[PDB]
Amino acid sequence: PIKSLLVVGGARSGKSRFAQRMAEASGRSLVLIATAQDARWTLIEAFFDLGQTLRREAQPERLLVVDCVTLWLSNLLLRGDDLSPPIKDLARTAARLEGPVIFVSNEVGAGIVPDNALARAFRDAQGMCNQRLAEACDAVTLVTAGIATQIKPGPEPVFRF
Amino acid sequence: PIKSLLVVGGARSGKSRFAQRMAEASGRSLVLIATAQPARWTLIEAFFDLGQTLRREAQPERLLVVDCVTLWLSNLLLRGDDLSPPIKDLARTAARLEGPVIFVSNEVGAGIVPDNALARAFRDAQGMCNQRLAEACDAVTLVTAGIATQIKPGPEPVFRF
Amino acid sequence: GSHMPAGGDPIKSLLVVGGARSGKSRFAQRMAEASGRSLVLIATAQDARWTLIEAFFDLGQTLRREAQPERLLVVDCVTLWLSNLLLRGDDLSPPIKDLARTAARLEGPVIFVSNEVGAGIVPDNALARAFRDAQGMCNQRLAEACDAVTLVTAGIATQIKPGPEPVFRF
Hints:
Three copies of one chain form a homotrimer.
Chain A: E1 4-9, H1 15-25, E2 29-34, E3 41-45, H2 50-57, E4 62-67, H3 69-79, H4 84-95, E5 101-106, H5 117-136, E6 139-144, E7 147-152
Parallel strand pairs in A: 1-5, 1-6, 2-3, 2-4, 4-5
Antiparallel strand pairs in A: 6-7
């Protein structure tokens, strides 16, 4: 079994629904950690203090689903925070949490460079954030048009030149 | 054999070329359903009435390639139409075709969307449409820099927490 | 025993493609540094082991001259090169075709770092649309010419070539 899963994909790719289905199959006590501004599911708000909330609510009998990382970074960005320390803190939290967690996050770097400095800083922070999370998490799935593809665990390619 | 293929990926990723290649190996009579407003291939235009055209023109003697779902959704959005009805109709049709169809569609959710309500609406609509076409079609392929990866059929990843 | 090409079935060419801040640049380094060759950065933007050569526009010319059996060139990166040509008003089709023909016919190994820019909504201007079309087209031709293609997502590399592409029978 795994401690941590990162689910990454485009906007409106069905990643939430995928994270939901993996969580329900765990037959553990299910918490939605909601970041945006049935009865087996407890909803907990975490608009800004995501790491603090995760450390508060995590326990071995619970599975927390963060829905979602991108709207948490949007909250921090608009509040004026430096996104780097909280991203780095979140990666430490994901590596050593006292209960299982699924993180839902968006790919935002696969379009044209934004014509707006905040959009660029956001694109960079979200890209760094997914790299840190993927490295810290036991498993990573890409979700494309509702279909999940595992990309960790799995060996990295090695090429000879 | 399969009845339905979705070819998804970024813009100018070689999706059309891949759909055309799968079509030409089929030995059926080949029809291009062209949604864009300005050999062994018949062209039939369907700027708006795509689900209608598919119910009427699909048949066991033919293979239709829809080129492409993104411009059809765009055509509707800019005409003023509500997008949820045509999308749910397309997905219903896609599950019940008279003969083989390949859907070409764009990923539009892996960037930073323009800050305008029309762009957000388009992104949400295109994303739910690809999820519904992926669910309805027998097979799905992601095309990356001209190279196709099959993601359906295939066993969905499972995890123990 | 059976034929395996000399040097442990090596590659001469690798395309690394991913979004902005996907970790593609640092995967390209890990690969370059396991090669044992003299490592050259071909910088397109206008360390002890790394030589740097700048090629803001003449990327084709520069690869042809500088590639050698004992060198590994890393092109960082295809997207700024293309951006450099677009802003100068150059026809993009000929240099793209010239670059993939160069990649197929190289005297020394080369890694190409390139961006995916085609998976969002393009701003409503003809220059953004032109760049999206050229970069998509350019990644298609490089992918076809290169021995190996890696997609890097959230700093995790997936090999998509070499490998059999799927076929669908109707």
